[model samples]
Target chain A: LQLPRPVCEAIIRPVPEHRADQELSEIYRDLKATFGVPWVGVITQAVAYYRPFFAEAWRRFAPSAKTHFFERASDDIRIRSWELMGQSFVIEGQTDRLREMGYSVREIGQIRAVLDIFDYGNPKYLIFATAIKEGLLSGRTFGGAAGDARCHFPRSPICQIDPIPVMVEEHHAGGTLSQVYADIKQTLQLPFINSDYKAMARWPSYLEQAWGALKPCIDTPAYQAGRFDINARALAALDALPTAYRMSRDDALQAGLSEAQTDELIQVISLFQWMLSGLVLNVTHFKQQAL
Target chain B: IHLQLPRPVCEAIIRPVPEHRADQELSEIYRDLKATFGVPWVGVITQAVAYYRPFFAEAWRRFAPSAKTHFFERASDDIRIRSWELMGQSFVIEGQTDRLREMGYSVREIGQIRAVLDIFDYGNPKYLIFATAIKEGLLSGRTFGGAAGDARCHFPRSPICQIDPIPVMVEEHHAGGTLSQVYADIKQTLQLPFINSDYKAMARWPSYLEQAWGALKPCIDTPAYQAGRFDINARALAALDALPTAYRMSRDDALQAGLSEAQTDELIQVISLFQWMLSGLVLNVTHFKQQAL
Candidate 1:
């Protein structure tokens, strides 16, 4: 049976950012504490829309969260993906450029650290989200004995990085910066600014110069060629990963979902998978230009 | 995806000045742009150039009329269709749609799923047009050096259906949990710097996304996705090869545009870079949607 679009939308919209009550706040709090991150990410927020699903999925996946293998697997994917796509040339001498612009060695390090954090965190989140989505659709539990036995990290630095302030649209509120933000949105055809740019805003001058230089190159053929190469490299890197798990539409249907439900689920998955893969291409492209 | 932070730690070097601030001559050029493109707003490319107002005005005068002609429009249209077709052919994910049918999806529901895919397909070509136009404008002085004729690739549009309204969560609004961890894992797996809007939107249907990813992961992490990427890149190259020598410029025209030969060459280089990037993106996005199906 086909659910109403509104029903599907409700189920799929990310969970509310602000908790309506203390009970919900606690759930959010526990999620943060468990994940060792300062903020609640999109996937959890999304699942939280369906409380029963969130509660059950969380319960099943919690044990794996505490395991070493989970961290290692996630880390491997992150490192490998970077190796594939992160190395390219556009801003090859960016460090020297920053130094020329009066940035201290420490500040440069900090900026790189911020980039590293995102590079590490973003892919990890994507994989975990994919895993949870798979487990939920297949009605199979994930991250228990196998998670425990596969690998171990007693002191994982999951979210231990110092906070880097990110700029949003509201902060730029109607100035040249605001116009730039708008331009970026329009040029990139993205609704939100990627965190890399926001973080780069930490060094206002660096961000400005970098963006100024990078802006002209953005729509050029050489840049596009580089991005294409990066996309291929990233895909190759992602494909090289050892198999982790598998689920199928047949498995999902056997889990008792109607055809409509399964289709809806596939639609959602396909959308994100396509999106994140593109992001890998984009981030690497930006890094090549900005770094 | 992650949460948005409160304030920016620093400021930018140069602010984005609007075209309105341009002197009268440049302002007239902006007006012409509005009339020519049939859009109220000037694009970022023009704004970026407006920082060098005199050169920008000159370039606009030389470039705009040619850009507005049907020759470029037809070329852009041809490339868009070809690029989209290349991506669609690369993924060959029709099998996945068939799998959905086997899993009991009605023909109508499958049409809806394909509808969502089609939306992305249509959207990508529009961006390609933008990118390609920028390239052609910058490289207007260069001689056409590619295949002799337009390949003129084409494909039928996928059936449309009312898409379910799913909110694509922005990173700043991401509510972290096991889902957050999943997002992190994906970043790691993919080696990306941020959670993409697509994932955030799909996170709305957490279970479906998780299960679908599980099934799809192996394929993605193997030669299948790689093969698709290669094919798409190859097609983009072929499409680019078929581009016409529409925007070539004369020495007088280049000088009239107030660009030194070196500056013009640099501009052309930048334009060429974006053309390839946008073309790659079109391929990537198309392949992604197909793989998801």
Candidate 2:
């Protein structure tokens, strides 16, 4: 039923005091005048806190099909990965800001952490690492060995030392694409060494070298994630630099050795490791053998 | 500034049941409302009495002789009337002031509204009569020198008018004659053919009166009252009078010009009545705070 026009007018008229200055009695009066009712504190408190939290939850969970693998597949995968990692870090920081606004940062973290756990210790990481390495290599060199090469990991060496390996022209015999295809088909029929095992054997030494390079940069207490007085000494000791492996080819080069003798020693060790591990240790060695 | 309506009027307007089957239907409504609200016996009865309403036609039908078997058909209208009278009494005491407060109107605004209601005969649709009067007041102003955009009669241009110095009308009751009929009447009375009083027409006009009252009331009561002693005096009339002049003509000049005698008289009549109404509003507001005996 319609209210008397005067009643409606009364109901619609504006209150004349600042809400901040209003006592409970005045609020009650205003309520009675306008709607003929008053509200409890529970309704007010519930609305004040819940709206912001609900809006933030919607932004973080929207899914995307674009994978990091596809993006880093180019010859410059390493540089691309580095750039992408920085971008992802910024996204994470924005998510943390949302957490400060009473949203669940823990929920977002848990989902991401769960996905990481599921994909842990898998071939996906290895493929990603290889793609990134290829991208890095391509960024530095003009291009990989063949501009048109579809496969990143070649089946056989392109050239070899000591007993000179069969050059591409000799292996194909005929100077035609069909002949090269035939040679590639024939080569695949033969048993090949696994490169992953070689990489695994060299992983510990490479990790040590990378850690040593990183240690000195992390000396300051404020730079560390934990307290300086309690954790500084232990962390410094734990992160102490490893000794140089003059005999290892990668180690000597990384350590800045510049002698011909050192180069010869590195080549001998490389050849020995290739023969012992039954795999090509480096792309340069593979290129030499294939040639 | 809550002003409770007389209990008798509230009960009279609020119907206990649909007109076709008075007692049974009213009982059914009471039962459902009681169940829905989960109030105790007296609470349900009192609340239902405060909120119920029936059309005049329906109440008239109850007194019709050839009606179906209903208690109201067999009984006199006096029973329903007495019940309504009691309901109105309770409404005046318990509910009217609170309901008005909830709608955001001040006591003075409510008193003005009551004064407007006082002029109505009240057996017909309450809104039609009230909206007619309000629209007449507006037209009365327009027939004279007042511009169409005066704040008291016309809706305010902004949704955020300050209620300082006086309570501003920021919003209006949406489903009232001010919206439906009075608005249509103004458009017709002004001969403004393009002014369509469609549902969305008022979207840009103002917030509903209740909503505006809620927004402007607090600003007027404490700060406006305490800071400047604005509320203690009969300032609403002054504010109404202070509205921008509608037109630019004196009575002698209007007659000296080409205006007809009737037109001039109409303009003067509107001016005098509006001023008188504004004064009546002020008087009513003064007595509004006294408790009903």
Candidate 3:
């Protein structure tokens, strides 16, 4: 998960669907359907920063993903994360901070609903981010026995909910909360915190304790073993698929990208993929905490 | 211009295809781009925007006749003049010309550097006009396109043809460890797709290009430089209204004519960077000219 400084600082700007031009916005919609998540993950939106590359990568990626093989593979990976580190996470003792902090029961339910959306979608994005990372690296992670007429995406009924809060940004996150965001990036070793945490930060006092406890668990053998196991399954999942065209560096060079640009593409792909494995686990950890 | 070129209104981009990547036909298009206005090199704006394919080829085909005319030359000169008038200049930097003198580069070498700057100093306005004209067509979808829209009164293409091939200049590929780093630094600092002919030709005195670009990089993004750019972009786009020949292309027209919605939106952004960028370069290269002249 360690990245060179250039890759860490490299612009991974997320294209907001609201701000996207018609061309990019159309791509966002297709991506939303593949995961059946109402909102696009910031991880996937970051790839849109390399728009032409993503469009081509998506054209090749989406087809195989629609097959029953991808959904099953994704679920299998989720199962592996659960088996490896699902219990390693220290579930909270229910500080019931929201109740203390003036949140009513209905408000607490909405907060739980937000976490559930991520719980449903994070593993799928692990697959999604890996699909792109592999494609940019020249591996066709989408065709082999992935053959099937379009299988149905697991669209949950909750996906119909339309009031997901906008992510809290750094400036709006007040002093102690802002310190948490900084620690989140440093401990996560990410240039920016993922939306999962940013959305959860909506209950600042809640995540404050959640992370304070969770931070201790990340250093445990079981948590790292889970991360290691999940990392292996990421490939195991992709190896099960393949696609037709070559999106190799050789081709990107032959097509038009410069040497530095090809390097940049590779680096950005790694940055997102590296984070998603650990990310899906955290989401898994939190969902179990809700239990 | 300091480092990152802000991504335009559309977050997506079709990064410019370098000439090394151009196909047999596309290579000629780059050549013809230089020959069209008798400039030594194709402007980065044209190089980057033209990758939109048969559409740019067609636009340039339409654009060619007017760009070659005496009237186009005068209008571009007027833009260059207006740019010069707005900015303050006494040609003194950190005594950069003095450094160039002390570095053993001759007065003869200074002319070589200015010759390249002059190429851009002369052509970027024409490019600015072309870029703004194309942007107007793509964004507003209301550009004039008929005989009535055409410039009716200009004299024909210029008779003073460029006699030689493009100037002998160093590029990133032909550089040393230092100059290659400098080239990427220049591209990185400028946030441009490629280093300009002005930068490349000035590399005939490698140390001087390094010193000049190293020094100018700091000022190119300051408030004054940024403030000057939009004033130039504003007047250049507005200047279109006064030209006899109105540029003819619109978003809906392109879509109707078989330009896909994807291609249309992509080209709008491709044109947007250089249309904004060249406006700034006109100031950078012009300022460099004053420092030397």
Cα-based RMSD of candidate 1: 24.4
lDDT of 1 by residue, B1-293 (tens): 32211211222121223543667776677666654443334434455546545556665554454344333333433444444454444344444555555677687666544434443443443334544544554444353323344222111111111122322443423556778777776666654434544455445545534544554454443444454444443444333334443333444455665777765555554444434444444444455455544
Instruction: In angstroms, give how far residue B153 of model 2 lies from its true place.
Output: 17
- Ordered from best to worst TM-score, the candidate numbers read 3, 1, 2
**lDDT tens string, model 3, B75-115?**
67667766665454422354466777888878877766765
Off by over 4 Å in 2: A1-291, B1-247, B252-259, B266-270, B285-293
What DockQ does every candidate get?
0.01, 0.01, 0.00
Instruction: Give the Å shift of residue A239 in candidate 3.
Output: 1.4
Clashing pairs in 3: A142-A242, A143-A242, B150-B245, B151-B244, B151-B245
Backbone clashes in candidate 3 total 5
Best by lDDT: 3
State the lDDT of candidate 2 residue by residue for B199-264, as single tens digits: 122223233322322332332223322222222122322222323332222344444544566654
Off by over 4 Å in 1: A1-21, A50-52, A86-91, A99-106, A132-173, A183-189, A194-196, A202-270, A280-291, B1-293
Please provide TM-scores, in order, for all candidate models, with all chains considered together: 0.37, 0.16, 0.45
